């Protein structure tokens, strides 16, 4: 049930011993899913399996870059199985893999509760793939999931976040910024990225760039430095959050943005990937439709000492970007400051 990211898979029907295939090596929406005898190197018979929310999988064709789908979102017996572009919010594109005792799988629609099937128990080339109600004895509903060779995934080196700078003396000049370090990344399939180098060409995109890397880079930025006299109160203002421009870059690239609660706000072609994104980039799922904006905060500092007190304030900066196989960036990064992750450092220490 834990299939491998970047492993090419073929689906061998128990009854026919023939393979899930896209009719005519077609690239377009609504192209028929059929069975066809084993071919040594036809990409139309190979699929990536990408894990989705709630332990479903996307079945992504290596020729088309489109996914296994139910024609017209039908819930009935005999409804046709086709390919269609990954939408995210289409339950007919989500598949649950039930393992049987002999190692075959039954492949159940999230939408319909019916399973992949060969129409009429047919054994011939080009026999149609449909959905049918789950049946205890129906070898036409059983598929062997066979590894057909794995593809290298992009990678980047991660490390711990820099610590917040501290005063050793009242005279120390604390840095404007710490080193920028990658604290997390996640590998997402091409279905997850709208890349202007490919536009709507899903076939060319999956052939050249089947997997992208979403990178999270973080550092501390100094907002304020001041030395308070004894008895001094120092008041100041900060601007935090994210530019509308940067939210638009996130939305058009990976179809998520930053919620007002600092969580990931998922919609469209990022739906189904909320668990992977939140877990692997170590950021909560947003509990709000409200989007983070630039906001102004008011701050005060009072000096509790009978001597001068040095004061700096640091805020956590997070930059996200999407990296191609070839190391280039899709669109541009988006950058936020988190008002809920700010630290004051003083000398003497408080
Ligand atoms: Ca079909």
Author numbering: 5 to 354
How does the study describe this entry?
We report the first crystal structure of Tpp80Aa1 at a resolution of 1.8 Å, which shows Tpp80Aa1 consists of two domains: an N-terminal β-trefoil domain resembling a ricin B lectin and a C-terminal putative pore-forming domain sharing structural similarity with the aerolysin family. We also identify that Tpp80Aa1 can interact with galactose-containing glycolipids and galactose, and this interaction is critical for exerting full insecticidal action against mosquito target cell lines.
Our final model had an Rwork/Rfree of 0.17/0.21 at 1.8 Å resolution and showed Tpp80Aa1 packs into the crystal lattice as homodimers, which could be indexed in the monoclinic space group C 1 2 1. The electron density map showed continuous density for residues 5–355 of the 373 aa wild-type Tpp80 protein sequence. The final model shows the presence of a homodimer with a large molecular interface forming an ‘X’ structure. Whereas the large Tpp1/Tpp2 interface may be preserved in solution, this is unlikely to be the case for the Tpp80Aa1 dimer—indeed SEC indicates Tpp80Aa1 is largely monomeric in solution. As Tpp80Aa1 does not need a partner to elicit toxicity, it is possible this ‘X’ shape is a requirement for packing and stability in the crystal structure. In Tpp80Aa1 we see a similar conservation (D73, Y88, S96, and E97) where the sidechains superimpose with those present in Tpp78Aa1, and we propose this as the putative galactose binding site of Tpp80Aa1.
